[PDB]
């Protein structure tokens, strides 16, 4: 009578508490290491990807961003790292980070033509061009705001208002302009000590421009500071301006909510259909652990920071 170990042949090993290399026959693996390598669609809906545009560029309607105007329903946002298009003008939008964070829970948009161009009074609006953002070699400007300028040496105070009627949460953007010196201000506009005021049911604001000298960036000595707000249903909003003003033309409307993510990957686009995504590639596996990158999107498995994990069974 001879009874003993179940004989087997093996090729790999495993670690333990008291040793580092012990051979094992059923070397079961649990860690996934291989990725496809190209960006691809999620759940059959094409994600939104940009090439050189930025969030500021897209929302503010950059002249070179014209291709992206009415983007349909998407899954997630993949914006090119270190955008080149971005904002051609050397401005600065207040609290960019909170806006970017807010954009992480929206799955659809709709542009609403709230304030028609013809509705504007005698106030001149056709001289708002800039050489910093050329189009086909010609001066141009943003395609989402209107820079009102004096006409016949006049500038009546603007007292527009708006009431939100549709059951949706509108989003509004506008801006203010910092000139360079006194003569420029009195040339473009009519009077000094300009101010703007915003009125709603939740906040107030009263601002004036800053006039001083600065360095030269892109051959310009002026600045633009933008601002934004969220409007509740059945609410009202009021604007007043005695001078410098960046009036809005198009508003944004939210119609769906869900899950999204801001992304900073570097790969091109392919034709596919996956379930998860990482900044280097897609995943088509079932293991519960991976170590490609901790910043995943979707129902991806968990992330660790190691190199070898074996849950093998068997003798030896």
């Amino acid at each position, epitope marked *: 009578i001879c009874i003993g170990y179940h004989a087997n042949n093996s090729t790999e090993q495993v670690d333990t508490i008291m040793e580092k290399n012990v051979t094992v026959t059923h070397a079961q693996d649990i860690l996934e290491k291989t990725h496809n390598g190209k960006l691809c669609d999620l759940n059959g809906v094409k994600p939104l990807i940009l*090439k050189d545009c930025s969030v500021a560029g897209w929302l503010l309607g950059n002249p070179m961003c*014209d*291709e992206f*105007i*009415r983007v*349909p329903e998407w899954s997630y946002i993949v914006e090119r790292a270190n955008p080149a298009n971005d904002l051609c003008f050397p401005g600065s939008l207040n609290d960019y980070e909170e806006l970017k964070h807010m954009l992480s829970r929206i799955n659809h948009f*709709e542009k609403i033509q709230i304030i028609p161009k013809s509705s504007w009074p005698n106030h001149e609006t056709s001289l708002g061009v800039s050489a910093a953002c050329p189009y086909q070699g010609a001066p141009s400007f943003f395609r989402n705001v209107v820079w009102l300028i004096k006409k016949n040496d006049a500038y009546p105070t603007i007292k527009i208002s708006y009431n939100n009627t549709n059951r949706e949460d509108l989003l509004i953007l506008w801006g203010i302009h910092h000139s360079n010196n006194a003569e420029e201000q009195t040339n473009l506009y009519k009077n000094p000590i300009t101010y703007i005021s915003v009125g709603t049911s939740t906040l107030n604001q009263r601002l004036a421009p800053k006039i001083a000298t600065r360095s030269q960036v892109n051959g310009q000595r002026g600045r633009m500071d933008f601002f934004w707000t969220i409007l509740k249903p059945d609410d009202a909003i009021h604007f007043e301006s005695n001078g410098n003003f960046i009036a809005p033309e198009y508003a944004y409307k939210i*119609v769906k909510k869900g899950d999204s993510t801001i992304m900073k990957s570097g790969v091109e686009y392919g034709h596919c259909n996956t379930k998860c995504q990482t900044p280097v590639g897609a995943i088509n596996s079932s293991m519960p652990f991976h170590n490609i990158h901790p910043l995943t999107i979707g129902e991806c498995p968990k992330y660790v920071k190691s190199n070898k994990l074996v849950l093998a069974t068997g003798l030896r």
Partner: antibody
Amino acid sequence: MQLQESGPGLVKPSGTLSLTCAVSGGSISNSHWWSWVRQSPGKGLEWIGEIYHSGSTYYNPSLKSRLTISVDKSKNQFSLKLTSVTAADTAVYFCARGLGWEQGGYRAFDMWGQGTTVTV
Amino acid sequence: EIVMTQSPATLSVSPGERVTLSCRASQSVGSSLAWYQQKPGQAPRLLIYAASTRATGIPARFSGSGSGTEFTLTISSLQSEDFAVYYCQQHYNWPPLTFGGGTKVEI
């Protein structure tokens, strides 16, 4: 603008159709979305797909796996290829152009060509 | 997906009088439909692209309006060249920009 359609009149079943729409007078130098529309009896008008000048493409989900658009900057010629003709219903095809940014960029097909048919 | 359907099929009208067309959708769309009219042997031309604008077509002769899931065109006058086939489409979401059914108005 003079939008012209160059078709071969392909018939051979289990073949690969290829119609090449070329733009005259104008050129591919502005923001637009060229499109294909096919008209067939019994179901009217179907939208085939669109493609921007930078390389972005949108296809019909019905024939996405079998249809492909290509473009040529050299002489501004954009073409369609469908790899199987057994599903073709001898519909009449047209290549058309939408509106520019001055109109708000709505997805409507403004300008249309002469149109040409094909049979299997 | 969004599916389009119009109930009436054939209308028989006299010149100069008032006619209505109906366009009945399947889901909330907003203001994102368009209308097309086809002449025999010719490509269509644009008449209504936004739900409440008339930048394309012939002014002061046609009109269309609606919301929710129901839309309607009125003319209040028509000439000998207005008899054609009319189509209703949506453009609220991509890719499947499906087209509506056909209807024929004639003497």
